[PDB]
Amino acid sequence: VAVERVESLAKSGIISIPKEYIRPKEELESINDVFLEEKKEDGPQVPTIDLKNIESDDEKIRENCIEELKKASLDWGVMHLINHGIPADLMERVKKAGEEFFSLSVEEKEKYANDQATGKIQGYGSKLANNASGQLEWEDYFFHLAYPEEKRDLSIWPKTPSDYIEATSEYAKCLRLLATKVFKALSVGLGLEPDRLEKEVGGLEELLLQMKINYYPKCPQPELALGVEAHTDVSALTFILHNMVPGLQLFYEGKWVTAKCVPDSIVMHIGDTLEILSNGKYKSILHRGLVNKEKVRISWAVFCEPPKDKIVLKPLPEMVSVESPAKFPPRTFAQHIEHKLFGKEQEE
Ligand SMILES: O=C1C[C@@H](c2ccc(O)cc2)Oc2cc(O)cc(O)c21
Ligand SMILES: O=C(O)CCC(=O)C(=O)O
Ligand SMILES: [Fe+2]
Numbered sequence: 001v002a003v004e005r006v007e008s009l010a011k012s013g014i015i016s017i018p019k020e021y022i023r024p025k026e027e028l029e030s031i032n033d034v035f036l037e038e039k040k041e042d043g044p045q046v047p048t049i050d051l052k053n054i055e056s057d058d059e060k061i062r063e064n065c066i067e068e069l070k071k072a073s074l075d076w077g078v079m080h081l082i083n084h085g086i087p088a089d090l091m092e093r094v095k096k097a098g099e100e101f102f103s104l105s106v107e108e109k110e111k112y113a114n115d116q117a118t119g120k121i122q123g124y125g126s127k128l129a130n131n132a133s134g135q136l137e138w139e140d141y142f143f144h145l146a147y148p149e150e151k152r153d154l155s156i157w158p159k160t161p162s163d164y165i166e167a168t169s170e171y172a173k174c175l176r177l178l179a180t181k182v183f184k185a186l187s188v189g190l191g192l193e194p195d196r197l198e199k200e201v202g203g204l205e206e207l208l209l210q211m212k213i214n215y216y217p218k219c220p221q222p223e224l225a226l227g228v229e230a231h232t233d234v235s236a237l238t239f240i241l242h243n244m245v246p247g248l249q250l251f252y253e254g255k256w257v258t259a260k261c262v263p264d265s266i267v268m269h270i271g272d273t274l275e276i277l278s279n280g281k282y283k284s285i286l287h288r289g290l291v292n293k294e295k296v297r298i299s300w301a302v303f304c305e306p307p308k309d310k311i312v313l314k315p316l317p318e319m320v321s322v323e324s325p326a327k328f329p330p331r332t333f334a335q336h337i338e339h340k341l342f343g344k345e346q347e348e
Pocket of ligand 3: 233
């Protein structure tokens, strides 16, 4: 076996990328210059959602917020969050600590290398081919469980930079509170009791927050490749930071919309797990990630997910009728992931 990193391929002095990184000729049609795509204000754009009044003591103004967030969720299922209560300073500590880890040599990152053949999923990694097409994506990553503190294996966290562990686990901490509030509003928006969605996905007890730093090296032929493939997140909610480089695209009314770079904001996705519980009301949107020649892109995605086995996920009884039956049969989290894999496995 051989290990190989996109970061290495990027610094090897290649003018054309390998065959495995080129998208199918059908998919190449839709890939354009991310920078030009960033300069278009024509057509649908991702909503920006202001969360200032999400817990507001004036019910008139709290309710307002809940409606914008609901509408945003029913429509797009993705949005830029502003005024979300996470310190701007703390967001910078996290990005700085992640930029520093990735600026170590590959050889020093390899010390944290994951090992999927032995079930070591946490760590420094790069996505291996997983069906008959050998397709790879133009990214390396760092993945670990983040919250709750008691479930973390800190021995896989970067010790250099020194501020990595503290920054990340205060961010997670802060993210869990935000998630509680979001779940609260989503719950109300749907008409349920306010605690509901959080306990259906696991509560404080069982809900997991996974951190994945997506590291997109510069790419010499960016318009042939993807950073991350077209997919929906399996999560209940995903929160994303990035280094103000464009690349996120959303598949919205039949076309690929590019996200803009809003400073001090957080991309939040509605994920499959909420879509299932809500019977398709809230949308787990399809999305992907483009690379470029000029700039390293980095994003920090935190996936708030249920326990893999323990909770049988399915549409809520409140959320089904004769007039609108269950759109999804019951599956555990792990089963849901497998059904998706199984589906995609069918190349040939
Ligand atoms: O979209 C993904 C990527 C995935 C993942 C990446 C790397 C790895 O080594 C293992 C898993 O983790 C997740 C976990 C979530 O609940 C929800 C998600 O949507 C995802
Ligand atoms: O890097 C990004 O902005 C996209 C991240 C993404 O879709 C993922 O990590 O699941
Ligand atoms: Fe995603």
